[PDB]
Design a protein around this ligand. Sequence first.
Ligand SMILES: [Cl-]
Ligand SMILES: [Cl-]
Ligand SMILES: [Cl-]
Ligand SMILES: [Cl-]
Ligand SMILES: [Cl-]
Lengths: 396, 397, 403, 403
Amino acid sequence: MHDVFICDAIRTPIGRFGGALASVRADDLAAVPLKALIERNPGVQWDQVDEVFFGCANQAGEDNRNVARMALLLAGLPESIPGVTLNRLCASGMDAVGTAFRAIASGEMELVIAGGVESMSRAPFVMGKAESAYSRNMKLEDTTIGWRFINPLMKSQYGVDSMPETADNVADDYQVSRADQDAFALRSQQKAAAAQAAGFFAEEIVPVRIAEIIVERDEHLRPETTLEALTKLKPVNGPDKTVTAGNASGVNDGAAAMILASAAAVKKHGLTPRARVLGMASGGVAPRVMGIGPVPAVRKLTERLGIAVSDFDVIELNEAFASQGLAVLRELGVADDAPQVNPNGGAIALGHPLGMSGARLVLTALHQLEKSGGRKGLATMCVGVGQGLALAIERV
Amino acid sequence: SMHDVFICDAIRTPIGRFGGALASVRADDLAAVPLKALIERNPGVQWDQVDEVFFGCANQAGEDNRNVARMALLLAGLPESIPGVTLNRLCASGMDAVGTAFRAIASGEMELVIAGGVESMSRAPFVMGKAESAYSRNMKLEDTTIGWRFINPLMKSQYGVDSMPETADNVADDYQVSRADQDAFALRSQQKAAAAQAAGFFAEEIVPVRIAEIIVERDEHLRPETTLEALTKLKPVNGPDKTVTAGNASGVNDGAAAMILASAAAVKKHGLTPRARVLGMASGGVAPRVMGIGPVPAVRKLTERLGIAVSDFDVIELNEAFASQGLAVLRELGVADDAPQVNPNGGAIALGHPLGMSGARLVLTALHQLEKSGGRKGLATMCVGVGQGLALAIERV
Amino acid sequence: HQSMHDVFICDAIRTPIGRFGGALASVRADDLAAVPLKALIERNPGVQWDQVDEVFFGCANQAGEDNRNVARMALLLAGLPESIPGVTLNRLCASGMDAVGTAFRAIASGEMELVIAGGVESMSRAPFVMGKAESAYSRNMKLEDTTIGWRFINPLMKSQYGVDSMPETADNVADDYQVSRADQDAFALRSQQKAAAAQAAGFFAEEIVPVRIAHKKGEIIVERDEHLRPETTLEALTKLKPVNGPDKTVTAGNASGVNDGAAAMILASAAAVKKHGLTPRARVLGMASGGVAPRVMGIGPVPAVRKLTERLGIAVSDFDVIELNEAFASQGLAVLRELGVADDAPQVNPNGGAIALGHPLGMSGARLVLTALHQLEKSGGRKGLATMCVGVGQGLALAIERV
Amino acid sequence: HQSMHDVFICDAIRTPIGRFGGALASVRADDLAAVPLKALIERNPGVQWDQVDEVFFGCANQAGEDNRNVARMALLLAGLPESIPGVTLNRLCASGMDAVGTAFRAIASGEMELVIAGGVESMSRAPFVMGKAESAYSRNMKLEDTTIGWRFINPLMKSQYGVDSMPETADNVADDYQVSRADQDAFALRSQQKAAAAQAAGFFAEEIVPVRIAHKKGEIIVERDEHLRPETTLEALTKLKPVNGPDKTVTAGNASGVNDGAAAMILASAAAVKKHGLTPRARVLGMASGGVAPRVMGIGPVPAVRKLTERLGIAVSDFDVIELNEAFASQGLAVLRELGVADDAPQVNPNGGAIALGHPLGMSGARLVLTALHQLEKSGGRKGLATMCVGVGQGLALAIERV
Ligand SMILES: [Cl-]
Ligand SMILES: [Cl-]
Ligand SMILES: [Cl-]
Ligand SMILES: [Cl-]
Ligand SMILES: [Cl-]
């Protein structure tokens, strides 16, 4: 096995639906971090990149037909560089990092780029083909988020709960109160606003130029959030439920990318190694409670590595919904407000462009370890239709 | 330390023609067919111990949306505790699933996995971009069956957006592959596939698809009736001075395939029969305009790292997207146009090409053929739209 | 002051009526509309065609190949001179009849002398429609079928009037006017029996021009109406399930279908009859329209017939033929009952109706006029009434007298 | 009695005309059609509304929220009694004028006494259309825009007549009839100047019912026609580039645009005027249509005017107002020249026309009639002519006389 080092990493700001990045095609957006990596790392011989791996949950729109390859070509990497796109919905960008790790670890590759993209603003409508001449049964479905082309067999066996519905199932089954979710959301807003003001996100961000407007800041943050404002919101799924627009992430646009390399490649390309990847693990759960998916993923990873959850100096836990973030922490024995968890806030504040988020969590965990002087970091997130993914790193 | 990785049982659906025998089957349900078969066929496996299902799929806009690997494993009746992930390297997706599964076991992260691929090109949906402005008159529906959609003006101006048949004419022109040679290659594919079908070779690979019942059991795309004279009469797709025709190109098709990969420890624990060890996978990039010679850098990269000459392989499964690029690849790698180890059971010109499933089929058929021929090493390689190649090597145990 | 002019119907001709996705499904609406126009040209060689004042066509859809004024499209495709104007009318189900009555008013008022009136519908080829986005990045895009029934539903229409489907309104009529399932089925059976008899007798064949269809290995013709179910029995009708649920009454067997077809006829003043060597067959007496609640649209003919007969001073019982469109048996019976005509009165639909023959919306009303006249000629009757209901709650009625 | 009845236009009203995607773009076509109907109700409180015989509306599209007989949809949304029937006419650009003439013929022939005629178009909201698959798993699905222009093109129409866009036809007219770029631009400038003056004088305000629109922070009222470019100068028009290339003459500045609007007016027999307390303003004299080659559709008004004037015995020079639709300055001028009227004759479009005001197809023809009448009243003129061209090669003309 070879050690695998994460080197430079960079991301776009995250835009609101229909907001600052809505005019940027997914393929063009994915190319922005790749162009930045090139500019930032002048020792690299770019013809020696073995592969670009990108996560993307949609792939029906301008991200169609292997967006990783489209993006590397738009970014001006050589046409000799291959690319492949991953889809594990919400966890896609993290899967790209872990898959990139496995490829180097197994000695198949030396120098790779891993990232993720989503343009949920620009997600297309889809229409199935007619199954008979003169069919009257043609319909358009929205690919922005959630179920489309529903399978009756899936509905009858597992249900087709919307993501907020699953988050309410978790709140119910795991006993997570409305008040606890609102406090978690408020802390996310507060920590993200502080991190933004400190310039932490600015160090992770490459601005996007739109032909020229410059988009430099994450757009989704609500720094003025207060507990009173959150308490007044009506639950999405009816008055007896707990999940609201204020204690859940949104749909968003963004891209992120990072360099991974073997020891030999770090030396050859003049890279700065920042952390080594320890491992990645996945787990599956009932679709109806997909939010709890990180629990088996984290347990699998930590048991194989023999590292206690309490040993991590940062835990970046995706905040798809406060209810599931809290439920996961509670099962793993971590306090709802533990200082190592999401110290710069998370997706409730920052937004959630599905394919990008998992790459962002890895790069931000590493960034946070560097600033805090921490050693081990854990990134983990839930996945639609009942999965979890977890990835651990260690600063060098 | 690295672990050896063994391919065990492997199975596929038949390949359907566009709008043909499998056109009524949702891609997710179709992907679930080989999964259910692996379950029925391998009674010793403790199925709650599968670490991951990896599936290739090039489209993902239709009933294969939102991570078809996970959708299929749930529809196949595998426990909800088993994770799944879907890979897209267009034409090579299914082979990428196998190579990705291999790397997960080889690195010690997993012990028992399923790798496969699916495509329902019959059912590929139309797509329409959202309006960029209120009352926009610029709304357009685009076919996702095959080829470019949502064309990026910057891709077109830098690299061109040549259709797959256009890229195959570019390869024919640049590598000097004659119409006559292309037609001869296509005839050989038809004759070899027809012979393999008759010998029951494909039946050993095929699990039937049940449609609520009608049962689909046979590969539908083959044209055993093909003659050189009929091929010679066809007009080139892209105009009179070109060479690629419907008869020297593959088609658009439906199908799924899956196979078990396992560490030595998992082979023992689950009572599996190891059939080959995976040696490695490599990828390569080329200009989009000549995507069909993509396999050349991929094969050169893999063979140089493994220290195995191309001439050392006992079978070469080279995908036949187009006769022109099949021949160009062989010539570049120093292999005869009719070498007996290449595509001995025929290939995509006869069998069809459901993008996401094809690369998984090539791996499992290369293995099948090694067993039939008593061969040792096998190479599967294929081209990829927008200019890539992928290659994967196995050795029979 | 100026005297009103008498208006005569001369030759008339129709295509066969095709089943949805059936014999005429490959024929564009505009080309289909041109088929009876071409037949009229072939059939009447004394006519100086550059003297046609107007072509009026009914068409309920106009979103598909029938877009942008199908009347004008059809006349040009039929080879009529480009100097001839055309206009398309839409009163849904009654459009074809409205074309005839509108042509009649144009001649009666002295504005024209020689006109063609007809109707067309290709329901097979009716397209889907999609509204534009109201905002950038809208998630609210929808595709809707235009074959039949509501699309782009207005919330105010739904709250004030409802948006009942056509079969739902037929059930409302059956409920309100108390028309039994048994009576509906008996009516449908009589329609199939009478149409089967008329077809065997060659009655429809006298109305029909065949349609040429492009085909591998050489073009073929469609010669016969395709919708008829001559082998229908009471037992088979009784076994069908109601479309809207177990305690409803309207079924696929006691309702018309969705269908393809076109029809056209010449109307002329006395002077034009003389100039063009035409054979006048009937004088048009008048047309009237009526409105009713949308939820019971099938009863629309009742105010329309009352309006027309009271203005003309003719009792309903005085007509020798009544062609009442059979959108649904429930509404056909309800209309007859309100008007004091027996459920099986011999002068009503004597050659059957849309339950057997089918209902391509824009053509049906023209068909009813030409077939009423045809029947008057075969029976030696004098006065004819054609009437039909209209979606969203109307009725239309037109009276003719054989000459 | 057997004489034709005189037919009077009484009250008339219209919405402002909106730009594409502009001030009225959020109003559904059916709701927009209802706006002038609701105004007519408030404005004419002597009318017994359940005695209206028919509502006739022009509408060129009918695929969108205007589907399924917008006349009937609009009257129900306006709160008119459900007993009132309605019918929709399509002669493309001339639909709303055809509604008026058709309403006239219905009363003149003695079949009705009290009607509403009007027109509507919402080109902003015109939908996309998609043909059905003609085979299972068809890859040949596509969307076409119904905003304006050809869709579902028939290969036979293309081969025999061409499928020239409307600006291409306007260039053909400019070429064939020799209308210079300079003259087109001068005509366009006169239209803007006269419309700006009429607007400033409050002339359009007398024709307009304002439309209330909701915004986030409260409601606004759209009161004014949005299309006008009062800042237009010859120098500005001179710098525009021709739509169809450099030896061509038609530009965005010498052509109308695409637009949204609706209009309606009451027509009544003398007996209905007396019973419903109406104020008669003009008598309708008659309407005539004509056809020309599609490729020069802009010249269509010439046969139409010739036919109407010959039948009525009224010379073109006898009219105190001529409202000639300004689809394109090239065809406007060509028509005037063929009819023997000076390019800048003071009786022609005295308050400007569609280059300034915009052209919501189905509405325009109704607007021309009501504005001709309005102008006759202001100027003390007696007879008025409204005429316009039609896509695919027609013209329509309608004459009125102030009472
Ligand atoms: Cl989703
Ligand atoms: Cl493709
Ligand atoms: Cl309907
Ligand atoms: Cl148009
Ligand atoms: Cl005026």
